[PDB]
Amino acid sequence: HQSEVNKDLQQYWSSLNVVPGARVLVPLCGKSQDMSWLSGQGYHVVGAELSEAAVERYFTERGEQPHITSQGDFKVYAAPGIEIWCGDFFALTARDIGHCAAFYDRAAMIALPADMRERYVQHLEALMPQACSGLLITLEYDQALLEGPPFSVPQTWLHRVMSGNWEVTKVGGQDTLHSSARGLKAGLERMDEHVYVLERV
Numbered sequence: 001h002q003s004e005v006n007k008d009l010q011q012y013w014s015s016l017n018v019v020p021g022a023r024v025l026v027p028l029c030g031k032s033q034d035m036s037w038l039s040g041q042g043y044h045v046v047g048a049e050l051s052e053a054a055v056e057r058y059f060t061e062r063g064e065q066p067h068i069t070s071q072g073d074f075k076v077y078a079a080p081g082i083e084i085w086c087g088d089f090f091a092l093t094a095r096d097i098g099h100c101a102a103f104y105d106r107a108a109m110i111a112l113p114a115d116m117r118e119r120y121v122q123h124l125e126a127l128m129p130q131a132c133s134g135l136l137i138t139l140e141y142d143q144a145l146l147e148g149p150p151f152s153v154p155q156t157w158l159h160r161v162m163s164g165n166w167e168v169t170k171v172g173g174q175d176t177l178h179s180s181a182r183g184l185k186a187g188l189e190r191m192d193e194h195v196y197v198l199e200r201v
Contacts, residue, residue, distance in 0.1 A: 001119075002013065002033075002037060002040070003033070004033055004178055004179055004180075004181060004184075005033035005034055005036070005037040005047075005168055005181075006033075006034060006135075006137055006179055006180070006193075006195070007099050007176065007179050008082050008135070008172050008195045008197075009034055009054065009104065009135055009137075011090070011198055012020065012038060012133075012135060012171070013035070013037070013038075013041070013102075013122055013133075013134045014133070016102070016133055017144075018102065018133055019042070020041075020042055020103055021042065021043060021044060022037045022043055022044065022100060022101025022102060022132070022150060023043075023044045023046065023097050023099050023101035023102075023132065023162075024043040024044055024045045024046065024101050024103060024104070025046060025047055025094045025096060025098050025101075025128075025129070025134075026045060026047015026048065026049075026084060026102030026103065026104055027047060027048070027089055027103060027104075027106075027108070027124060028047075028048065028049070028105075029047060029103075029104045029105050029106035029108075029137070030047050030048060030049030030051070030084050030086065030088050030105060030106075031104075031181055031182070032181065033107075034104045034167050035047070035104075035196035036100075038104070039081075039082060039152055041201055042099070043101065044083065044101065044154075045082045045083060045084065045172055046082075046083030046084070046091075046092065047083070047084055047085075047089065047092075047103070047104070048076070048084065048085045048086075048087065048088060048089030048092060049066050049077075049084060049085070049087065049089075050074075050087075050088060050089050050108065051086065051087070052073075052074060052075060052087060052088075053132060053149045055068075055070075055075045055077045055087045056075075056088055057078065057190055058077055058086050058098070058177070059183050065077045066078055067085075067188075069077075069085070069137070070092075071087060071088050071091060072088075074082065074087040074088025074090075075087030075088070076091075076125065077090070077107070077130045079184045083092075083097075087151045089094065090106065091190075092154055093095060093127060093182075094124070094126060094128055094129065095127050097127055098129025098130070098132050098200070099128075099129050099131075099132070100128075100129060100130060100131045100132055101129065101132045101133070102132045102133035102134060102135070102200075103110065103129070103132055103133075103135075103200070104123070104134075105124070105134055105135060105136040105137065105198070106137050106182075107139050107150050107179060108120065108178050109121060109138055109151075109153055110136060110139065110150035110151045110152060110153045111148040111149070111150060111151070113151070114135060114151075114157070117151070117153060117157075117161070117201040119162045121157075121158070121161055121162040122161070124197070125162070125164075125165040125166055125200065128165070128166070128200050129200055130200070130201075131200065131201065132200040133195070133197075133198075133199055133200065134166055134197075134198040134199070134200045135195065135196075135197055136158070136162075136168070136195065136196040136197075136198055137172070137180070137194075137195055138172075138193075138194040138195065138196065139152065139157035139180065139182070139190070139192065139193050139194060140152035140174070140192040140193075140194060141185060141191030141192045142182070142183070142188050142191045143173070143191070145187060145188065146182065146183075146186035146188060146191070147182075147186055150180070152192075152194065153194075154162065155168070155169075155170040155180045155196055158160075158196055158198075159179075162198065164194075165200070165201060166198035166199055166200045166201060167197070167198060167199035167201065168196050168198040169196060169197040169198075170196060171194055171195040171196060171197050172194045172195025172196070173193070173194075173195075174191070174192030174193065175188045175190075175192075177193075178193055178194075180193040181194060
């Protein structure tokens with residue numbers, strides 16, 4: 001129970017104590033522990049898994065069963081248990097689903113450049129809810145072993161751009177390889193994991 005689910009995540013949340021049943025969005029954050037945590041608490045875990053090969057792995061491991069959709073070059077595999085559509089994320093209106101609650105954001109913009117980053121955060125906060133607690137999970141170390149080289153997006157930058165719709169705050173740190181799942185997924189065995197608490201106002 002809550003073995004390795006972003007100490008910060010389980011922390012902030014543990015404290016936050018969002019509404020029981022609030023809408024929890026999972027923008028290209030779809031991991032397992034994060035969501036498994038939210039659910040374990042009793043929240044509306046609805047997000048997408050920006051991972052094609054992943055969806056495939058799920059279809060091969062399960063052998064079909066859930067709602068598989070073909071979204072262009074991406075897929076959408078939703079389950080009856082959770083509202084996680086493995087594939088791509090860009091047709092669930094994080095705003096409609098968001099509304100009020102929170103959303104776990106996984107290092108995604110760090111995989112892109114600045115310009116794109118600004119367009120990403122903005123695009124998110126744009127399609128974001130009205131009152132939800134968002135938590136971004138970035139990284140630094142990982143870059144030459146982890147899936148996609150993270151630009152260790154600087155909190156300052158986030159507060160420079162990602163500042164204007166959500167209260168982003170510096171959080172997290174390094175020496176947390178066990179915590180970060182992606183670390184055990186890619187195999188960092190030691191990487192700095194950055195975190196930023198963004199309160200979607």
